Design goal:
This is part of a larger assembly, with 3 copies of chain A. Chain A is of the alpha+beta class. The first copy, chain A, is built from 4 helices and 6 strands; from the N terminus they run αββββαβαβα. Chain A has a two-stranded antiparallel ribbon. A two-stranded antiparallel sheet of chain A has the order 3-4. In chain A, strand 1 and strand 2 form a beta hairpin. The interface between A and C is small, with 5 and 4 residues. The structure holds calcium ion (CA). Chain B: Homotetramer.
């Protein structure tokens, strides 16, 4: 089912040209014991329709009741604990009732790190 | 889904680039939430909602006052 | 009239105290004339608020997103609030980014038990445990709760 991924999506801006996508598939973190995830490499040119169809139909995620996208900074260090409570006892606790997609940085930066741990705790 | 899917943006804080992000997310209509008391672009946008150059310098000491 | 107008040009430095309290008005007047935001100019006001138990003044004026606080600013105020039994300031200072894991050390933990009243029961228990200098709190816990339920303090 993932075979046509290099054909629908492209990797790498007038100095560059598009090429078939190479990095894709499922993703397992070594020794984390977490559920098997999914990942994809794609260019910024990609229109959202193909990616949304991929997520909803190939990866099998159901349509979300609501979507909240969290944007912020502070980079490395974790936020002050009242922001932590706003994330956990606020946004994530509310999203637990309706079911939702929470979109943010997928990195170990502070905001994404605390979003992930709050989602895991309520999971 | 045939129910519409609401989308919301939450702004904890930000640098000068988060102002551009908010402007782009506002021109293409998307509701935004600003966290009060967290400083940065969130507080800068919150305090004007509810000395303007002084405020902009207060939350962006190095910012370009006219462009901001 | 000219003098009064010259004075009233700068109302930020004037406050009215009415008999209908003193500490709140002092805090308001001190905050009103600060201006800067480097978090070094507000330490004095924070110490005064801790000493006078002005929770709302601190939470409203001193801890705003403009002022960029961090741990080393608030450690001394946290210790002051711990020693002098100010629960609201203990809650407020921790919620604003004071890393408790790094803050707590055996030295300060022993210093906290030094704040017990001289005639209190815990003081007598600590003295008896020491007569049987670390705080020796674990010995007191063993004497009180027994081996079955006593925590092996420190945890
Ligand atoms: Ca001062």
């Amino acid at each position: 089912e993932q075979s046509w991924i290099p054909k629908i999506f492209k990797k790498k801006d007038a100095h560059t040209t598009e090429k078939p996508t190479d990095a894709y598939g499922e993703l397992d973190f070594t020794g984390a014991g977490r559920k098997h995830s999914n990942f994809l490499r794609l260019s910024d040119r990609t229109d959202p329709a193909a990616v949304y169809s991929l997520v909803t139909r190939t990866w099998g995620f159901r349509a979300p009741n609501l979507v909240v996208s969290v944007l912020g900074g502070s980079g490395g260090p974790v936020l002050q604990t009242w922001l932590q409570d706003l994330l956990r006892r606020g946004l994530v606790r509310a999203a637990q009732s309706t079911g939702a997609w929470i979109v943010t940085g997928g990195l170990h930066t502070g905001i994404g790190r605390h979003v992930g741990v709050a989602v895991r705790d309520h999971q | 889904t045939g129910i519409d899917i609401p989308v919301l943006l939450l702004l904890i804080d930000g640098d000068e680039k988060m102002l551009t992000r908010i402007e782009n997310a506002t021109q293409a209509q998307l509701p935004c939430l600003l966290v009060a008391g967290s400083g940065g672009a969130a507080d800068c946008l919150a305090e004007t909602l509810e000395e303007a150059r002084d405020r902009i310098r207060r939350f962006f000491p190095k910012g370009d006052l006219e462009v901001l | 009239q000219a003098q009064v107008e010259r004075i009233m040009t700068r109302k930020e430095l004037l406050t009215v105290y009415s008999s209908e309290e003193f500490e709140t008005i002092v805090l308001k007047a001190l905050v009103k004339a600060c201006g800067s935001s480097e978090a070094s100019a507000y330490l004095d006001e924070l110490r005064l608020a801790v000493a006078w138990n002005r929770v709302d003044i601190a939470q409203s004026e001193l801890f705003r997103g403009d002022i960029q606080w961090r741990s080393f600013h608030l450690e001394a105020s946290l210790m002051d609030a711990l020693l002098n039994d100010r629960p609201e300031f203990v809650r407020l200072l921790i919620s604003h980014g004071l890393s408790l894991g790094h803050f707590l050390t055996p030295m300060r933990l022993a210093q906290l038990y030094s704040a017990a009243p001289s005639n209190s029961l815990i003081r007598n228990l600590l003295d008896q445990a020491s007569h049987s200098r670390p705080p020796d709190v674990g010995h007191v816990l063993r004497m009180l709760l027994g081996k079955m339920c006593a925590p092996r303090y420190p945890s």
